[PDB]
Structure 1
Amino acid sequence: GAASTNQLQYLQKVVLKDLWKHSFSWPFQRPVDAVKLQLPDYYTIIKNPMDLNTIKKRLENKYYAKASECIEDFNTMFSNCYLYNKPGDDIVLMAQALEKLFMQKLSQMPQE
């Protein structure tokens, strides 16, 4: 298909899949459960929550019109983690490692 089709296909079949398979993806595989995690303030602080399963469903459901919209959701997921947590926290180190992988896969995004 067209470049834009290949881009969203790449985000689903390669980028999302490889991030999910990474050993540090588990905190990012579901929405934050504020009661379970004992964090009453999470959704007061984070007003545009995002996670990999939401992104997965959106790609499956053909929700994104173009790749940039999907990339915005991945970046939001990482930014939320940096904003909510503190420097040096384990969850931040995990996010940073995942983001490094994300950036590597993006650097090979097709443009045709």
Structure 2
Amino acid sequence: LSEQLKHCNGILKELLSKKHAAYAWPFYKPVDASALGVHDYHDIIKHPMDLSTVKRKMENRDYRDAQEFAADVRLMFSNCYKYNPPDHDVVAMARKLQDVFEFRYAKMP
């Protein structure tokens, strides 16, 4: 990994850590639309994303730079904001996790 990608990996590890689990947990694995009963999810969300997918991509060296990584993390949040009403509990969780993400991403070397 490049130096900037190492910082990205550090952020990813933090997003997945116990420190943030109270609001990060919905983002750990791909949304299971059937399990959640949200039978319109894949009509609304054309490009699903979640932290396990970002992690696999990082491990496989799929991201060529920090910008590509950030676009995926942001896509994950955006999907949450697109599908759910803005007053929803899961949206509040997304906003909190995104605050953690954006502030640390801003500290990129």
TM-score by length of 1: 0.91
How far residue 20 of structure 1 moved from its aligned partner, in angstroms, is 1.1
User: Helix, strand or coil: the match of 1:32?
Assistant: coil
Distance 1:29 1:85 in 2: 17
CA RMSD of aligned residues (A): 1.0
Distance 1:88 1:17 in 2: 28
TM-score by length of 2: 0.93
- Alignment pair present for 1:16 and 2:12: yes
Gap regions ≥5 residues in structure 1: none
Question: What is the percentage of aligned positions where both structures have the same residue?
Answer: 45
Q: Which runs of 4+ in 1 moved over 6 A?
A: none
| Greater radius of gyration (CA) | 1
Q: Which amino acid aligns with 2:12?
A: L
1:1-112 → structure 2 map (5 Å cutoff): 5-12=2-9, 14-21=10-17, 22-23=20-21, 24-110=23-109
Q: Which amino acid aligns with 2:37?
A: Q
Gap regions ≥5 residues in structure 2: none
